[PDB]
């Protein structure tokens, strides 16, 4: 089988500015090669076919060229919702065959997170489990350190985080990160704290709680 | 226009066999092939063979054919899909996509099919409010939320008041607990305001379990 080698694998750029990605193929494949946009959540959508030709209602800042096995994407002018993980795909040989894809980040001006914190529901608490959720929101760039305390002392092994893909529109972050205790343990103590560390902050920031 | 309906997510024990379905409308379903992909971590973008309805004919990737089989049935529009012997390694999301009679590139695709391989039991989540308060304020707006707890498998769908509220929304990505149970988060920024005049319900379905849950999420 044909394989596809896209680079790079990440690229970083800021809104207005030109992206470039290329792929090769094993060996050639005429003009046989499409590119794809994958934007989180979403089947990919065909942009370039035989290489070089803008399918239906693709914007013109969206082109291909290369013949044989060297392929160029480019995006003259990024713009933030041009987050996507790019593919390119031939169907010259069988069967076809995709590139690894680039991953499309955008680069955008420091933003602080704003924190929130939340206790366990009443009802939660039913269940014998209590979960305690700190919530960072609409930060950039990505880098954050989230601790708990609880009176003070450090937590270690019982909390978990998740983080959204870039937003789209403003090309931040949101970052949760989840806090589980027995109701048992919820209830021995008082104090709830999360700590955020982050670099559109000049020291870090700590959200509280007094459980009652 | 075109449209490629797949069928919904589905937990698979390892060694069962699974069926799933792509129904096309907007076009004349008997004249156009249909092709399958596979999208996982592993090995990202698949191709695993193609469907053409008007004479029957099958083309499989020979690395797909001893598991994957291929049929149609005209009469409802709709192409299947069946995988045998299922391991870990065929837990990916399985789209059918479209050509454009120009060679094997895709046009339309399906939404997709999230299929898991596990030996965990089906669970629908528990769905908690994360109320507002003053240590979720931040100048005339606050954050709320709810939390989808301990459920199995992938996927869970949320939106907030039926769709009516989609600015400042967050749905996490699900993490897999120790418990080897997904969990999640859905959170939402609104003016504090609106706290006492419009009322803030999550919608939360699990069509592995067949649920959908509603909570409404009030200052506690």
């Known amino acids: 089988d044909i394989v596809m080698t896209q680079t790079p694998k990440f690229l970083l750029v800021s809104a207005g500015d030109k992206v470039t990605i290329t792929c090769k193929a094993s060996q050639s494949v005429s003009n046989d090669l499409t590119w794809y946009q994958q934007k989180p959540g979403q089947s990919p959508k065909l942009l370039i076919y035989?290489?070089?030709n803008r399918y239906t209602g693709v914007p013109d800042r969206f082109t291909g060229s290369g013949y044989g096995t060297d392929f160029t994407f480019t995006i003259s002018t990024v713009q933030a919702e041009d987050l996507a993980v790019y593919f390119c795909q031939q169907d010259y040989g069988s069967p076809p065959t995709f590139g690894g894809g680039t991953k499309v980040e955008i680069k955008r001006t420091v933003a602080a997170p704003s924190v929130f914190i939340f206790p366990p529901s009443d009802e939660q608490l039913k269940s014998g489990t209590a979960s305690v959720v700190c919530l960072l929101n609409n930060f950039y760039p990505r880098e954050a350190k989230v601790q708990w305390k609880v009176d003070n002392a450090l937590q270690s092994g019982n909390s978990q985080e998740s983080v959204t893909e870039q937003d789209s529109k403003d090309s931040t972050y949101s970052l949760s990160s989840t806090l589980t205790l027995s109701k048992a343990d919820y209830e021995k103590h008082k104090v709830y704290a999360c700590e955020v560390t982050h670099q559109g902050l000049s020291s870090p920031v700590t959200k509280s709680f007094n459980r009652g | 226009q075109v449209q490629l309906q797949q069928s919904g997510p589905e937990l698979v024990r390892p060694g069962v066999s699974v069926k799933i379905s792509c129904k096309g409308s907007?076009?004349?379903?008997?004249?156009?092939?249909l092709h399958w992909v596979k999208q996982s971590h592993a090995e990202s973008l698949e191709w695993i063979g193609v469907?053409?309805?008007?004479?029957?004919?099958?083309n499989y990737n020979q690395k797909f054919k001893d598991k994957a089989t291929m049929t149609v049935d005209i009469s409802s529009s709709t192409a299947y899909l069946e995988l045998a012997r299922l391991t870990s390694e065929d837990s990916a999301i399985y789209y059918c996509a479209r050509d454009w009679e120009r060679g094997d590139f895709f046009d339309y695709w399906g939404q997709g099919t999230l299929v898991t391989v596990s030996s965990a039991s089906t669970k629908g989540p528990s769905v908690f409010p994360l109320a507002p308060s003053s240590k979720s304020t931040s100048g005339g707006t606050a954050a709320l939320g709810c939390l989808v707890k301990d459920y199995f498998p992938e996927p869970v769908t949320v939106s907030w008041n039926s769709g009516a509220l989609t600015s400042g929304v967050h749905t996490f990505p699900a993490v897999l607990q120790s418990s080897g149970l997904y969990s999640l988060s859905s959170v939402v920024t609104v003016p504090s305001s609106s706290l006492g005049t419009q009322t803030y319900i999550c919608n939360v379905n699990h069509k592995p379990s067949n649920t959908k849950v509603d909570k409404k999420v009030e200052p506690k």
């Open positions: 035989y290489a070089s």
């Open positions: 469907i053409r309805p008007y004479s029957g004919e099958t």
């Open positions: 907007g076009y004349t379903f008997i004249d156009e092939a």
